[model samples]
Target: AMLDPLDILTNIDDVLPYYQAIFSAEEQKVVGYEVLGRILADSEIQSLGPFFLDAGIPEEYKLEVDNRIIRQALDRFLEADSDLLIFMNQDANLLMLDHGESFLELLKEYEAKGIELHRFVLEITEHNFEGDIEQLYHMLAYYRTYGIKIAVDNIGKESSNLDRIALLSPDLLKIDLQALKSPSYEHVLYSISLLARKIGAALLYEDIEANFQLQYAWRNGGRYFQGYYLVSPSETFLERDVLKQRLKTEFHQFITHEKKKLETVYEHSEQFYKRVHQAVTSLRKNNLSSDDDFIKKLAEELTDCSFRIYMCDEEGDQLTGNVFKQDGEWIYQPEYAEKNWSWRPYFLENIMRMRNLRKGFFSDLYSDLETGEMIRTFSYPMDDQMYLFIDLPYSYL
Candidate 1:
């Protein structure tokens, strides 16, 4: 028997112990082992500290590097003539390394370099720091003093500290893709997005490549997008031709998919109408009394045929609007049913409108407390005897 390619790929871990050992050893030194959720070994911290110092990144050179990166980013945007915003990740610890005054000169340089502070969104990425949140807030305040915008990145990932981030009131709140996928975390993410919107902050979705994930983000009120689907992080800015082509391709595909989905809905609706027509026509031929038992069977048959169905009298008033779930429930007002229910305002309005029109009629979607559903009523006149009203639950459908 031959093994499938996927099976072989799945078992790669079984045969890669030797290679994994080497990588594991390196990672253990750099990442360290977790002890009660804290790194037990100082090897990772020690290694990183010297590495930064030896990299020849002087304390004074911080602003210079930032200015250079901003200049290059701006040049790329100009060459492409794109109006999209650029998100630049800056090490948070480095920004706070000085007493909130070190980046002043650098801010001046960036402004002089012709990079609009508003267009450049500075994001805080993964980094460890030691300071009161007040100090960090003060530092952000000073950063804003220079007209620089701020954003917190990789939120809902790791020790992504929401409280501190909220205190800063950054211009953007970036959400992680993995966090959005978790059922437990979805509500939190949605609430945060709403809060961000209320505060005039843009909700930025990162790593949102999947169609469903993008839809979720959009439905939850995300305005700014990042990730491979929208735009990947490139060393240089994307060219105009490439950007235009990508946008066109995505837009065309989205439109096509939505149109097909709408067509499917229309076909389903037509089939539903036919099924209801058959059931109603059959019921009319029988000498069934308008009792509870008869109403239950009729409601069940209609519901099985369509998304929703309701029966009303000549004045368009629902006497026993039975839903699929609650079979024997009645919505009619007891005293109002016998004496010309035609006088009721709601029924009279629709009755008058339908008389002016011809054949079947559909009302606009409206909420009915009687049914506890967003519903639309459809009516077909059955001679001068009575008006047949069918209630469709829009939400359920």
Candidate 2:
């Protein structure tokens, strides 16, 4: 049922067992397989399964049927011996934890059979979080006592609340790749990635079917990758070493190619920044002190590539008005003078860097508060005591 989200099953035994490999992004190798269940029969009456298991089975038979399936799965997992991932809805997990004694004792029985609970991760399958999240955390806490890792699958799909995610503190977060295809969702994906890191959870990308999707996963924050593109599910365990070698070669090539592309971008930036530096240096040759007209002319020359310009002293205190491009003309504004900027990230560092090297600096991209645009700060020393700062939007790249 964890494998198929579009169908329902009437019989637990009718569910077929399979394994899909989850490759670790950290090691760039296959670490384990996620134990998956598939309901297969000859016709639509039996082949059809609802997305949620409760929709297919009678409420009266649910607990007993799933308990039997759980027992078989544990014994089979004991015999399988490969690292494995398994998940269940909150109710099924609770049912398996007990024949009695509030279900914690049920875990010991499986542990007694020589199953390594450390190698197993029980994922939360249902996407809806509006239900009793406290109850969900209770079962998860119980699972944790025996060293079984907890995961929440289908993040960013439905009912993905940060408050609930924070409360659960899961070890792994499963994200479906379908939502990552749109540019509109880029910010959401980035936000989720940040939250995942802040909580110290691994990001796992699912349903990957293309090579580009693999690159996308790596570019984001994926710690584990799974999909048909890497390996299809099999009735038995698949070998990992072969896929490991294959991915190593491909990923190395991707890394090399991506780095070259970035170098190309930096090269272009270096050339343009140097050109602006030359223009400002030309103005400095005349000792153009307090000449707003000279600064405005240079600002107009750089206006196509930059939107904001100003001068700051070596101590990171603004010394000149902000000269900005507005209404197709270079406009000087005096409102920004005397503001200290040393508190901004790496502001003093860049100042010292330019002073030491006597060269321009190209900062890594950051956000512009006023326009809410991604921008970079390009700073070049005009002399020992002052530096010219230009803020360029990402479009300049």
Candidate 3:
């Protein structure tokens, strides 16, 4: 019962189709379809290697077999519903053989007959069958001249050539959903996000099977989403109403939660400012010097979270060195005295802010050049001439 490659290609009905609907984030709808050809029966062993079996699209093999698949797909493309993006993979082997131009010309012929070139997205993936790097890119670049968009698929699944991906500068970067659903691959997802931003490309996270994955994609800069969670690829063009409603509700919940967290941060910052202002006011009232033991004790009592406290003049000159704490014990470092810190980015800005607003503010987390740890500085206005500075490690935040 094994279907022969030649026989299947020759005798197959052109009407049989494989479809995966594509969702557009901007529209929040399943805008168009990706042709993922129907799977062959189990008996169709090794008909054209794993490509056809894996994709269910009769794409990839050697020579005319490739032509047959593309021709069949193009024939079906006309009949499939559109007014949106249409995706078809370009075989690495064929492109490497310098046949991409011919293929594009074929597509051009179809365009002349009314197939929209603007709607076509020719995808090349991170797969085997690499040939001439420069030549392969040249072919792809050539195809772009006719308004045919490009997509680089299957990123982060393997060690694909990053330079070539850059050179491709694809309009869309297709990231598989497998890596995103796992915690271990978080780095991969972030790296992909960076690369996508660098290339000015949009992320397309495919195979998203869960609400969480969908959210991850959206949060991670996915401009396009396609997955079983939204709608399994099928021959028919499914309505996007259900998917749209789910996305709206889920994203609303996310927005709500994030808003609450932001409010908490502001509230926490207010509490921190109040507590800090109280401690400094008490120090001023007790008339303690910056190095006084009582001042250190009061700082310790303020919070176990306190990192180190110091006194500086409004002009950014250290007045009393650093009264820093470590291991539940406070220590005074005299060597920090007279240090000018006005040159640090935002240092002068923070001073000006305190001078005008007469209030303390929290610094964003930054790398400490000395300790090589992430830290934040709490800058508080002690008076017109003096300011109190507290340095806290990121762990405290």
For all candidates, what are the clash counts?
0, 6, 1
**lDDT per residue as tens, model 2, 223-251:** 88899999887656665564777788878
Candidate 3's TM-score: 0.75
Which residue pairs does candidate 2 place in steric collision? 7-49, 7-50, 8-49, 8-50, 97-103, 98-103
Which candidate achieves the best lDDT against the true structure?
3
- Worst-scoring 10-residue span by lDDT in model 3: 44-53
Q: Give the Cα lDDT of each candidate.
A: 0.53, 0.70, 0.71
Q: Which regions of candidate 3 are displaced past 4 Å?
A: 1-16, 42-49, 52-66, 79-82, 126-138, 161-163, 180-195, 240-242, 284-298, 308-397
RMSD of each: 14.0, 4.5, 5.1
| TM-score: model 1 vs. ground truth | 0.48
Taking all chains together, each candidate's TM-score versus the true structure is 0.48, 0.80, 0.75
